[PDB]
Design an enzyme around this catalytic site. Structure first.
Site, PDB file in Angstrom:
ATOM      1  N   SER C 147      -9.112  -1.411   0.983  1.00  0.00           N
ATOM      2  CA  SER C 147      -9.760  -0.271   0.292  1.00  0.00           C
ATOM      3  C   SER C 147     -11.147  -0.728  -0.145  1.00  0.00           C
ATOM      4  CB  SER C 147      -8.976   0.188  -0.897  1.00  0.00           C
ATOM      5  OG  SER C 147      -9.711   1.174  -1.624  1.00  0.00           O
ATOM      6  N   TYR C 160      -3.902  -0.608  -8.059  1.00  0.00           N
ATOM      7  CA  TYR C 160      -4.034  -0.404  -6.603  1.00  0.00           C
ATOM      8  C   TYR C 160      -5.164  -1.302  -6.051  1.00  0.00           C
ATOM      9  CZ  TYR C 160      -5.542   1.735  -2.215  1.00  0.00           C
ATOM     10  OH  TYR C 160      -5.973   1.953  -0.951  1.00  0.00           O
TER      11      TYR C 160
HETATM   12  N1  LIG Z   1      -6.731   7.886   2.549  1.00  0.00           N
HETATM   13  C1  LIG Z   1      -7.633   7.246   1.812  1.00  0.00           C
HETATM   14  O1  LIG Z   1      -8.588   7.842   1.281  1.00  0.00           O
HETATM   15  C2  LIG Z   1      -7.532   5.783   1.612  1.00  0.00           C
HETATM   16  C3  LIG Z   1      -6.545   5.031   2.219  1.00  0.00           C
HETATM   17  N2  LIG Z   1      -6.491   3.664   2.059  1.00  0.00           N
HETATM   18  C4  LIG Z   1      -5.373   2.838   2.633  1.00  0.00           C
HETATM   19  O2  LIG Z   1      -5.190   3.132   3.985  1.00  0.00           O
HETATM   20  C5  LIG Z   1      -3.790   2.956   4.355  1.00  0.00           C
HETATM   21  C6  LIG Z   1      -3.325   4.231   5.003  1.00  0.00           C
HETATM   22  O3  LIG Z   1      -3.406   5.274   3.992  1.00  0.00           O
HETATM   23  P1  LIG Z   1      -3.170   6.845   4.294  1.00  0.00           P
HETATM   24  O4  LIG Z   1      -3.436   7.179   5.710  1.00  0.00           O
HETATM   25  O5  LIG Z   1      -3.969   7.622   3.282  1.00  0.00           O
HETATM   26  O6  LIG Z   1      -1.642   6.999   3.867  1.00  0.00           O
HETATM   27  P2  LIG Z   1      -0.549   8.169   4.093  1.00  0.00           P
HETATM   28  O7  LIG Z   1       0.114   8.156   2.770  1.00  0.00           O
HETATM   29  O8  LIG Z   1      -1.193   9.292   4.785  1.00  0.00           O
HETATM   30  O9  LIG Z   1       0.451   7.439   5.152  1.00  0.00           O
HETATM   31  C7  LIG Z   1       1.218   6.327   4.605  1.00  0.00           C
HETATM   32  C8  LIG Z   1       1.983   5.676   5.736  1.00  0.00           C
HETATM   33  O10 LIG Z   1       2.627   4.483   5.244  1.00  0.00           O
HETATM   34  C9  LIG Z   1       4.026   4.671   5.297  1.00  0.00           C
HETATM   35  N3  LIG Z   1       4.600   4.154   4.070  1.00  0.00           N
HETATM   36  C10 LIG Z   1       4.282   4.512   2.789  1.00  0.00           C
HETATM   37  N4  LIG Z   1       5.002   3.888   1.893  1.00  0.00           N
HETATM   38  C11 LIG Z   1       5.903   3.139   2.643  1.00  0.00           C
HETATM   39  C12 LIG Z   1       6.984   2.304   2.286  1.00  0.00           C
HETATM   40  N5  LIG Z   1       7.351   2.014   1.040  1.00  0.00           N
HETATM   41  N6  LIG Z   1       7.678   1.730   3.294  1.00  0.00           N
HETATM   42  C13 LIG Z   1       7.308   1.995   4.556  1.00  0.00           C
HETATM   43  N7  LIG Z   1       6.329   2.764   5.012  1.00  0.00           N
HETATM   44  C14 LIG Z   1       5.658   3.306   3.982  1.00  0.00           C
HETATM   45  C15 LIG Z   1       4.263   6.170   5.454  1.00  0.00           C
HETATM   46  O11 LIG Z   1       5.473   6.530   6.150  1.00  0.00           O
HETATM   47  P3  LIG Z   1       6.695   7.115   5.231  1.00  0.00           P
HETATM   48  O12 LIG Z   1       6.120   8.269   4.455  1.00  0.00           O
HETATM   49  O13 LIG Z   1       7.751   7.592   6.258  1.00  0.00           O
HETATM   50  O14 LIG Z   1       7.184   6.026   4.329  1.00  0.00           O
HETATM   51  C16 LIG Z   1       3.094   6.542   6.345  1.00  0.00           C
HETATM   52  O15 LIG Z   1       3.262   6.284   7.736  1.00  0.00           O
HETATM   53  C17 LIG Z   1      -3.055   2.581   3.060  1.00  0.00           C
HETATM   54  O16 LIG Z   1      -2.861   1.173   2.979  1.00  0.00           O
HETATM   55  C18 LIG Z   1      -4.023   3.101   1.996  1.00  0.00           C
HETATM   56  O17 LIG Z   1      -3.916   2.410   0.767  1.00  0.00           O
HETATM   57  C19 LIG Z   1      -7.540   2.994   1.389  1.00  0.00           C
HETATM   58  C20 LIG Z   1      -8.584   3.646   0.889  1.00  0.00           C
HETATM   59  C21 LIG Z   1      -8.507   5.105   0.721  1.00  0.00           C
END
Ligand SMILES: NC(=O)C1=CN([C@@H]2O[C@H](COP(=O)(O)OP(=O)(O)OC[C@H]3O[C@@H](n4cnc5c(N)ncnc54)[C@H](OP(=O)(O)O)[C@@H]3O)[C@@H](O)[C@H]2O)C=CC1
Ligand SMILES: NC(=O)C1=CN([C@@H]2O[C@H](COP(=O)(O)OP(=O)(O)OC[C@H]3O[C@@H](n4cnc5c(N)ncnc54)[C@H](OP(=O)(O)O)[C@@H]3O)[C@@H](O)[C@H]2O)C=CC1
Ligand SMILES: NC(=O)C1=CN([C@@H]2O[C@H](COP(=O)(O)OP(=O)(O)OC[C@H]3O[C@@H](n4cnc5c(N)ncnc54)[C@H](OP(=O)(O)O)[C@@H]3O)[C@@H](O)[C@H]2O)C=CC1
Ligand SMILES: NC(=O)C1=CN([C@@H]2O[C@H](COP(=O)(O)OP(=O)(O)OC[C@H]3O[C@@H](n4cnc5c(N)ncnc54)[C@H](OP(=O)(O)O)[C@@H]3O)[C@@H](O)[C@H]2O)C=CC1
Lengths: 251, 251, 251, 251
Positions: C147, C160
């Site tokens: 991030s 976070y």
């Molecule tokens: N979107 C943004 O603005 C930002 C995103 N990020 C980072 O980018 C990455 C992707 O984020 P983003 O696309 O927004 O996330 P989403 O929440 O859109 O997607 C999250 C993904 O991770 C999986 N996931 C979540 N929690 C778990 C868990 N406990 N166990 C297994 N799988 C899990 C979900 O599948 P399921 O729901 O089936 O568990 C899903 O495929 C993350 O690491 C996030 O912190 C960083 C900066 C900002």
């Protein structure tokens, strides 16, 4: 404190603004201070008088920077002026503080303006430090006054930022080279700092709000960091870039 | 790929070394490449011939950098040379690659040598970029070739490092200013890179061992990063300093 | 392109958002993609169907992260799921993308919330990478999705940011360790990125204005950087933190 | 000096090593010091006796960190111990110094070892700082003791580096949040530092040679930086990471 007791300092542009605060702090702590300046003889005399009034020792050193032979002229005047104090040659603390601003964005910068800001801000410190190595003692201190603008983008002053960016890069290379003799080399980077030379209450408000403390820097805020870096307390800090901006650019 | 299909690039010092690899990669991907150089007409002709042989389009642009009117002369030759290709004016991709080394530590550097490395490495790119803003299109790319030495202290080349440090600081300020028109500005910093111009097997071994991969960089390693930065795939990367050193200075 | 032709990738949280864009880009470029997820079986099936529809190969891998045995369960499901594809064991490209947000400032964070964000965001990637070393091939790629908030202070998400800061520090140490086998390790740091899961037009405007481009990131902006980092074109980039924020925090 | 005259400090792991040097320096400068520790009651008593012998005021605070209720137990003992001194509640200076090493590379780290180093090094400081906000006065100081290893890759201690990397990221976010009340938040990062707990003359030589000064750090080298950061002289330094390594990793 007296943590600079018996040490000789040179402060470039020591006559006003941050340079004057540095000069006065080092002298108050027992340093013999060479107050260097290029133009205003009167300012340099008042600054030395202020130090002498408070019980400290200082003397003026005239050399215009950003001109042929500037570094050689500065060290000739220092050696002469210093010799005339009846102190031995050489020094403990070098502060490259002298600098000029260029508040023009890239589309505005002329060759003349660009060449002048590099000559004063970068070229002069580089050759000043080069000749200081003939004189600078073991356990000595080299401190460059840079700008927060090298790390937080300010298009309006781009050529000035670049001149300070080149200066930033001299610090680590020299810290490495001079470590075996106990000399530290560090950059102190001021933020928006209120000098004798920020009349617009509107610019004053915007620059104040850039700090997490909601105020402009004072010369004293910078001088207090520089004095620490120049002391034995900072013997283990070398090659670093010390933010003295009151938290500008944190978030 | 053809990710530079229909784009005009200028590569300063595009005739040999990293510049030649950049020139050839951009042309292979469909760019019309201005191969700029200061001295070796023959090298520039071979590089253009190599591109034309492989099915791409390039033309030479002669301008000596680090001299009065260099930036104006380069853009005059570009505009003329470009016009003579029957393409419209202006460009999509500017790579400031041309540079010279100064392998002298601080005690060795003369005014002449210092002035020359700043003139070529810093001053020329600055005024070259300034005049590019008359010609550079929306969604365009500015890429500066810097040096790993701005971030990992190399006393032996200190004045060269400083010249690249000033160049590093131009990138964020311009990225901020040009963002509203979709232009990205980035620095690519090579490590120890083996060019046509590292004969000592001993220096070769020491520089190889600086990389976590145990080899020298090749021009192609740099060109592959530059081509990505120049492409639509890097539209969301701006103001950055991209390490292309094979992990020099990690630990 | 086909620059991932014949390679096996694992993308953690590959089912939606940035993970889905990464999964789809790697597959479109010829990778066999393990689409990992913890909860939504349906989302994971749609993502695999989308890839299979477009001519690529992918399969789901179910493992809940942030629980006892998560890393072991993920690699067991991967090895099983992978084996069931009739491909050999092991992999070329590991993307730790899965993560959860914690939008509470320090005074608000409970032990349970803190422990959960570290367990998913930091602990799981660490043990996932540890077990990947049994399977990860020469010339391989490890990519952590971090991030922008580790480098630009955001008090509202402090715990976070810390979880991503720990993850950032794994990259250089592993790049150094794995260099001798041609493996690169890099962090890609997204900015404000618009996923399927930014309804407030006011928050949308403020986050858009943080970019020098005046828009939110799209999953595709991140996936295009990740695909480059995962490719042979980025062989000379290792141990780095690649800003994929559209110039957030420049000035 | 007496630059901490009339101030209350808490130093976590203040009983030995860097914590003891910090405790003794702050007390010598007029601070009332809470010497916190988890295990060795005897060490804590000697450290308080040393301070009381030299003319300063200190008292022990027992709390084991990295266990359920650690932060709550520490502040309960502090409030009790502090109250028993007949001083008012609250504090001016918080130093999170307590930490444990984990000298295992990634392939060696167990869940138990990983969980313990995060619990002590990251989790405890986070909740300790959270509860300090009920007590911490205007113009106050928060100082985290990190490690040079967050910025210079050391695979052999990777999980330890990550725990300090998370801690590094707490500093800017809190500096921003607490600026309006004149509180500064900073990280001090020691290098290879010789404590009471570097018997191998060979390891001693290798770690000494990592410094540009050719020696190991002493607790006092760290304490002298921390005391400055804790003082009014550092009022304009916030959100920073102060290298206290004697120039480790410069080139
Ligand atoms: N979107 C943004 O603005 C930002 C995103 N990020 C980072 O980018 C990455 C992707 O984020 P983003 O696309 O927004 O996330 P989403 O929440 O859109 O997607 C999250 C993904 O991770 C999986 N996931 C979540 N929690 C778990 C868990 N406990 N166990 C297994 N799988 C899990 C979900 O599948 P399921 O729901 O089936 O568990 C899903 O495929 C993350 O690491 C996030 O912190 C960083 C900066 C900002
Ligand atoms: N104030 C601020 O907000 C900021 C300041 N800085 C930097 O801090 C340093 C001190 O700045 P500040 O206190 O504002 O400056 P002032 O302009 O207040 O003082 C400048 C000093 O430098 C001397 N000087 C200027 N030009 C020359 C020259 N050509 N030859 C010799 N001496 C010269 C001046 O003496 P004389 O007039 O007699 O020549 C004077 O002593 C500079 O390097 C500046 O760039 C960085 C960030 C912001
Ligand atoms: N190779 C390495 O290990 C490293 C390289 N770099 C940087 O990468 C860039 C490319 O370097 P590299 O490939 O080694 O260089 P080479 O010396 O191989 O090629 C230099 C190029 O720049 C041109 N050039 C040189 N001086 C001038 C001048 N005064 N006016 C106009 N053109 C000029 C040359 O053409 P002509 O001869 O006709 O003038 C030529 O095309 C440089 O900026 C360099 O500093 C950085 C880190 C290390
Ligand atoms: N020394 C070095 O070379 C380096 C040190 N550091 C960091 O500097 C800091 C100080 O290190 P150093 O002086 O070497 O450490 P020492 O191990 O010498 O002292 C550790 C201190 O922390 C306390 N402590 C340890 N674990 C716990 C616990 N679980 N609960 C409560 N208190 C605890 C100890 O008291 P007790 O034994 O009674 O529990 C003691 O006062 C640490 O954060 C360390 O990571 C960073 C870089 C290198």
């Amino acid at each position: 404190t007296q943590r600079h007791q018996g040490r000789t300092a040179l402060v470039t542009g020591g006559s006003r603004g941050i340079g004057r605060a540095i000069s006065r702090r080092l002298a108050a702590e027992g340093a013999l201070v060479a107050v260097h300046y290029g133009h205003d003889h009167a300012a340099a005399e008042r600054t030395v008088k202020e130090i002498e009034t408070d019980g400290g020792r200082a003397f003026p050193v005239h050399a215009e920077l950003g001109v042929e032979g500037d570094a050689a002229t500065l060290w000739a005047a220092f050696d002469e002026a210093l010799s005339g104090t009846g102190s031995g040659p050489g020094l403990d603390i070098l502060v490259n503080n002298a600098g000029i601003t260029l508040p023009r964005p890239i589309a505005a910068v002329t060759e003349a303006e660009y060449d002048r800001v590099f000559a004063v801000n970068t070229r002069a410190p580089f050759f000043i430090v080069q000749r200081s190595l003939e004189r600078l003692r073991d356990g000595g201190r080299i401190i460059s006054i840079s700008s927060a603008a090298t790390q937080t983008a300010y298009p309006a002053i781009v050529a000035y930022s670049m001149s300070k960016g080149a200066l930033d890069v001299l610090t680590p290379a020299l810290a490495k080279q001079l470590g075996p003799r106990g000399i530290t080399v560090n950059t102190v980077a001021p933020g928006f700092t209120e000098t004798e030379i920020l009349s617009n209450p509107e610019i004053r408000k915007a620059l104040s709000s850039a700090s997490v403390f909601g105020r402009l820097g004072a010369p004293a805020d910078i001088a207090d960091v520089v004095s620490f870096v120049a002391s034995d307390e900072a013997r283990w800090v070398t090659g670093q870039w010390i933010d003295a901006t009151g938290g500008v650019g944190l978030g």
